[PDB]
Ligand binder design. Structure first.
Ligand SMILES: *[C@H](C)[C@H]1/C(=C/c2[nH]c(/C=C3N=C(/C=C4\NC(=O)C(CC)=C4C)C(C)=C\3CCC(=O)O)c(CCC(=O)O)c2C)NC(=O)[C@@H]1C
Lengths: 161, 49
């Protein structure tokens, strides 16, 4: 796992070279985005449960998944799906705050598709739920922070697809 | 110069040549100076990837 600063540092180290102008510019860009990321993370922490609730309501209710036969049936499976969405939201917020997707790659994506295939859960339905979480988060946070969260959420969807 | 050549400056006195080619501009790096062949540091080369 690595934020933007650590990613730049590790890349420069692997080349065995100091922090040149490009690396300094990238670090300055991250520093400029830091306040935005902090405020967005605070807002999402404040409204984390509501975001998942609204996304599920507007994306994954009153359908076959909720109905018996769908993999969201029963309190157990519905809670598992809700916890999956909460995990997605929290880890996407982590990735947004760190300015890098390595945390998602090593803590989320690895084995996610394998477990989803093993348990037969709807990858398409999960993708749509992630979409709905994306719109809710964008609405709550704003435009630019919304896009920053959405890029990571779409990365999660692409990895899971 | 034959019957068809315009004359031209063929020789220069040393004083005139010095006036022309001894100013800060137009002075070669190697004329009256020890030119040390610049080379990257050996440790920099060793640590270079
Ligand atoms: C909800 C949007 C969709 C859905 C979800 C759902 N998932 C499971 C079970 C699992 N999901 C995971 C995935 C992860 N666990 C993690 O800790 C992380 C790391 C970031 C991920 C990605 C795992 C490991 C499981 C199995 C273990 C568990 O106890 O959850 C279920 C239940 C499956 C079952 O048989 O119990 C459900 C319902 N299902 C849908 O239909 C939605 C589209």
């Amino acid at each position: 796992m690595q934020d933007a600063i650590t990613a730049v540092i590790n890349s420069a180290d692997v080349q065995g070279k100091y922090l040149d102008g490009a690396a300094m510019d990238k670090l300055k860009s991250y520093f400029a985005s830091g306040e935005l990321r902090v405020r967005a993370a605070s807002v999402i922490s404040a409204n984390a449960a509501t975001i998942v609730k609204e996304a599920v309501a507007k994306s994954l209710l009153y359908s076959d998944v909720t109905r018996p036969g769908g993999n969201m049936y029963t309190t157990r499976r519905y809670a598992a799906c809700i916890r999956d969405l909460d995990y997605y939201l929290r880890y996407a917020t982590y990735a947004m705050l760190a300015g890098d997707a390595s945390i998602l790659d090593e803590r989320v994506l690895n084995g996610l598709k394998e477990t989803y295939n093993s348990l037969g859960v709807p990858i398409s339905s999960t993708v749509q739920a992630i979409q709905a979480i994306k719109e809710v988060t964008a609405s709550l946070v704003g435009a630019d922070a919304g896009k920053e969260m959405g890029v990571y959420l779409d990365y999660i969807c692409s990895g899971l697809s | 110069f034959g019957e068809d050549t315009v004359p031209y400056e063929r020789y220069l006195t040393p004083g005139g040549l010095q006036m022309r080619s001894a100013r800060v501009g137009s002075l070669r790096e190697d004329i009256g100076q020890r030119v040390d062949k610049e080379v990257t540091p050996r440790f920099v080369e060793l640590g270079q990837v």
